[PDB]
Paper text:
Multiple system atrophy (MSA) is a progressive neurodegenerative disease characterized by accumulation of α‐synuclein cross‐β amyloid filaments in the brain. Previous structural studies of these filaments by cryo‐electron microscopy (cryo‐EM) revealed three discrete folds distinct from α‐synuclein filaments associated with other neurodegenerative diseases. The 3.3‐Å resolution structure of the Type I2 filament reveals a fold consisting of two asymmetric protofilaments, one of which adopts a novel structure that is chimeric between two previously reported protofilaments.
Here, we use cryo‐EM to identify a novel, low‐populated MSA filament subtype (designated Type I2) in addition to a predominant class comprising MSA Type II2 filaments.
Numbering used by the authors:
A (entry chain M), B (entry chain K), C (entry chain S), D (entry chain Q), E (entry chain W), F (entry chain U), ...: 14 to 93
J (entry chain P), K (entry chain Z), L (entry chain b), M (entry chain V), N (entry chain X), O (entry chain R), ...: 21 to 100
Write the structure that this text describes.
Amino acid sequence: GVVAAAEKTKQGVAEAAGKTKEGVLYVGSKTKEGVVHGVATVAEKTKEQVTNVGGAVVTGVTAVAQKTVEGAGSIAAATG
Amino acid sequence: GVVAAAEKTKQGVAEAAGKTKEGVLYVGSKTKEGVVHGVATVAEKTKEQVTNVGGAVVTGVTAVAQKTVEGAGSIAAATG
Amino acid sequence: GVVAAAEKTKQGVAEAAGKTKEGVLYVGSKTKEGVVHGVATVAEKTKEQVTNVGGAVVTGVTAVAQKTVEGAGSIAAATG
Amino acid sequence: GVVAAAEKTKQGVAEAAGKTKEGVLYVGSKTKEGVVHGVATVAEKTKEQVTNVGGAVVTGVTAVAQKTVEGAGSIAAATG
Amino acid sequence: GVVAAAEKTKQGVAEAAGKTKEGVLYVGSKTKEGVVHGVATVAEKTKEQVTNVGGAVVTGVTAVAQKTVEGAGSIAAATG
Amino acid sequence: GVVAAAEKTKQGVAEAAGKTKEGVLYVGSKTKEGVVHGVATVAEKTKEQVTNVGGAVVTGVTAVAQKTVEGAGSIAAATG
Amino acid sequence: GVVAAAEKTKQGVAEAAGKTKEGVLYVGSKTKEGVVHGVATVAEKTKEQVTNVGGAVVTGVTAVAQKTVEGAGSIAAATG
Amino acid sequence: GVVAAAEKTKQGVAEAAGKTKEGVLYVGSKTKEGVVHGVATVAEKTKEQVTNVGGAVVTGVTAVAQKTVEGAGSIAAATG
Amino acid sequence: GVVAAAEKTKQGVAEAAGKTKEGVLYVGSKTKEGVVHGVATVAEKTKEQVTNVGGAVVTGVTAVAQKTVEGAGSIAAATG
Amino acid sequence: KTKQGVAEAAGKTKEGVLYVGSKTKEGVVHGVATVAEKTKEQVTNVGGAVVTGVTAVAQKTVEGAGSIAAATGFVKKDQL
Amino acid sequence: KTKQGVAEAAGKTKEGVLYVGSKTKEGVVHGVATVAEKTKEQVTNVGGAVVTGVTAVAQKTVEGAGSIAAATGFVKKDQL
Amino acid sequence: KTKQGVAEAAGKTKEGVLYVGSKTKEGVVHGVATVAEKTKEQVTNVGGAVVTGVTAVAQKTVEGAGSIAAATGFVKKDQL
Amino acid sequence: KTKQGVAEAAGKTKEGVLYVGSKTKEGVVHGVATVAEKTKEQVTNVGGAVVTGVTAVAQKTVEGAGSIAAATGFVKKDQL
Amino acid sequence: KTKQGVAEAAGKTKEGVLYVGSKTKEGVVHGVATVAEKTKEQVTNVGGAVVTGVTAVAQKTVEGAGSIAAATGFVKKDQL
Amino acid sequence: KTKQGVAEAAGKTKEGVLYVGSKTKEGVVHGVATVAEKTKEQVTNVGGAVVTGVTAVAQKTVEGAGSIAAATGFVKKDQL
Amino acid sequence: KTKQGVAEAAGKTKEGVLYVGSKTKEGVVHGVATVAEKTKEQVTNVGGAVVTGVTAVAQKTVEGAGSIAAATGFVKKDQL
Amino acid sequence: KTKQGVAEAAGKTKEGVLYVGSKTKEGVVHGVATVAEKTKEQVTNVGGAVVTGVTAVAQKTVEGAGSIAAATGFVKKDQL
Amino acid sequence: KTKQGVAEAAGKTKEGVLYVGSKTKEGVVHGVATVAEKTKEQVTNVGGAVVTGVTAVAQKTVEGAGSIAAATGFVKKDQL
């Protein structure tokens, strides 16, 4: 039982609410989720080698922002 | 039982709400999910090699923003 | 039971709502999901080699923004 | 039971709503999903080689924005 | 049971709604899904080679915006 | 049961709606799905070679905006 | 049961609707699905070669906007 | 049961509708589906070669806007 | 059961509709489906060669707007 | 000498294709698109002006002191 | 000499493709798109001005002292 | 000499593709998009001005002392 | 000499692709997007000005002493 | 000499791709986006000015002594 | 000589890609986004000014002594 | 000589990619985002000024003695 | 000579990637974000000024003796 | 000579990546974020000034003797 009342008033406001659930709000904000910024490499000879024979390999520069709900959020998964 | 009332008022507002669920709102914000920004490479000889023989390989510069709901959110998956 | 009432008022507003669910709203915002920005490479000799023999390979510069619902959101999948 | 009422009012508004579900709305916003912006390469000799023998290979500059619902959202899939 | 009423009013509005589901709306917004913008390559000798023998290969500059519903949204698929 | 009523009013509007489902609407917006914009290549000798022997190959500059519903939305598919 | 009523009113409007489903509408908007814009190539010698022996090959500058409903939306398909 | 009524009104409108399904409408909009715009090539010697021996090859500058309903929407199909 | 009524009115309109399905309408809009616009080539020697031996080849500048309903919408098909 | 509102162009070439264009727009109204769907309008006017339609007016004048382009919806009762 | 509102261009080439363009817009209204769907409007006017429509006016004047482009929706009762 | 509001361009090339463009906009209104959906408006005016529509006015004047572009929705009762 | 509001460009090349552009905007209104959904407005005016619509005005003037661009929604009762 | 509000650019190259651009904006209003959803407004005006809409005004003037861009929502009752 | 508000750029290259840009903004309003959801406003005005909307004004003036950009919502009752 | 508010840039290269940019902002308002959700406002004004909306004003002036940008919400009753 | 408010840059390279940028901001308002949720405001004004909204003003002036940027919410009753 | 408010940069390299930047901010307001949630405000004003909103003002002046940036919420009753 929720009741609000206003009467005999020049400017009256009556506001009622049974159940309320506030939510997220960003005002003038900034965010950085999974960011790579400013990587420099000065070599003479570079060499990479990957010899995957049935798994999962993730190399190089990476930036991930997974947001899964009802499952594995792996980056490199390998099941058998 | 939710009740609001206004009467005998020059300017009256009555507002009622049983159940309310607020939601997300961005006002003047910025976001960065899965971003690669400013990568520099100054070499003389470069060499890459990938010899995948039945798996999953992900290389180079990468930027992912997966948002799955009811499944695996892998980047490199390898099942058998 | 949700009730709102206004009476004997010059300017009256009565507003009622049983159940309400607010939603997302962006006002003057910016977003960046899965972005690659500013990659520079100054070499003399470059060489890439991929010898996939039955899997999944993803190379080079990449920018993905998957939003799947009821399935795997892999980037490089390899099942057997 | 949702009721709104206005009476004996010069300017009256009565508004009722049983169930309401708000929706997404962008006002003056910008978005960037799966974007590659500003890639520069200054070499002398370049060489690429791909020798796929029955899988999936994705190379070069890529920008994807998959939005699948009831299926795998892979970029390079390889089943057998 | 949803009821709205206005009476004895110079300017009256009564509006009722059982169930309502709001929808997406863009007002003065911009979007970028799967975009490649500003790629420059200054070499002297370039060479590409692809020797696919029964799979799927996707190379070069790419920009995809798949929006499938009830099927795989791969970019390079290879089944057998 | 949805009811709206107006009476004894100089200007009255009564509007009722059982079930309503709003829809998408773009007002003064811009979109970019699957776009390649501003690619420059300054070489001296260029050479491409493709030797597909029974699969699917997609090369060069590409820009796709698939919107399938009940089928695979691949770019390069190869089944057997 | 949906009812709207107006009576004893100088200007009255009564509007009722059982079920309503709004639809898409673009007002003063612009779209770009599958677009290639501004590609420049300044070489001295160019050479392309394609030796397809029973698959599907798609090269050059491409811009596709497939919108299939009940079938594969591939760009290069190869079945056997 | 949908009912609207107006009576004892100088200007009355009664409008009823059982089921309604709105449709797409473009007002002052522009669209670009499958467009190639602004491709320039300044070489000295150019050479193309295609040696298809029983598949499908699509080269050169291309711009497609397929809208199939109950069939494959491939660009280069090759079945056997 | 859909009913509308007007009576005792100087200007009355009664309009009823059981089921309604709105349709597409373009007002002051422009469209571009499958368009090639502004291709320039400044070489000294050009040479093309096609040696199809039983498949389908499509080259040169192309602009297609297929709209099939119950069949494959390929550009280059090759069955056997 | 004096130049106002002048669009000028020039072009020289020895061999090749040439295009020169010069367009000028002064006092031009272009593209006024309007839709009214299922709209109710009720007007009662007594000795006044009511405007509800679409009015597109363009004017260009040289030596036009005291010019008026569009005077819409007004009541003028000057004594002198 | 004097230049106001001038768009000028020039171009020289010996061999190749050339494009020169010069456009000028002065006092131009472009692209006024408006939609009103299921809208109710009720106006009672007594000796005044009411404007509800769309008014797009463009004007260009040389030597236009005291110019007015659009005077919309006004009541003028000057004594002198 | 004097330059105001001037857009100027120039270009030289010996071999290749050339593009030169020069555009100028002065007193230009571009892109006014408006939607009103399920909106109720009720106006009672007695000897005044009410404006609710869309008014897009553009003006350019040379030697325009005392110029007015848009005077919308006003009541002028000057004695002299 | 004197330069105000001037956009100037230049470009030289011997071989290759060239682009030169120069744009100027002076007194320009671009992109005014507005939506009103399920909005109730009730106005009673007696000898005044009420403005609720959209007013986009752009003006450019040379030698414009005493210029006014947009005078919206006002009551002027000057004695002299 | 004198330079005010000038955007200038230059570029030289022997071989390769070149881009030169110069843009200027003076007195420009860009991107005014507004939404009002389920909003109630009630106004009673007696001899005054009420403004509730959207007013986007841009102005540029040379030699504009005493210029006014936008005078919105005011009551002027000067004696002299 | 004198430089005010000048954006200048220059660039030289022998071989490769070049980009030169110069932009200037003076008296510019960019990006005014506003939303009002489920908002109640009630105004009673008697001989005054009330402003509740959105007012975006931009102005640029040369030799503008005594300039005013935006005078919004005021009551002026000067004796002289 | 004299430099005020000048953005200048320069760049030299022999081989490779080059970018030169120069931007200037003077009297610029950028990004004013505002939201009002479920807000109640009640105003009673008698011969005064009330301001509740959004006012974004930008101004740039050369030789502007006595300039005013934004005078909002005021009551001026000067005797002389 | 004299330098005020100057942003200057320079860059030299023989081979590789180069970036040069120069930006200047003078009298600039950037990013004013505001939210009001479930807020009640009640104002009674009698011959005064009340300000509750958002006011973003930016100004730049050269030779501006006696300049005022923003005079908000004031009562001026000067005798002389 | 004289330098005030100057941002200067320089850079030299023979091979590799280079970045040069120079930014200047003078009289700049950046990032004013404000939230009011479930706030009650009640104001009664009689011949005064009340300010409750957000006021972001930025100003830059050269030769500005006697300049004022923001005069907010004041009562001025000077005799002379």
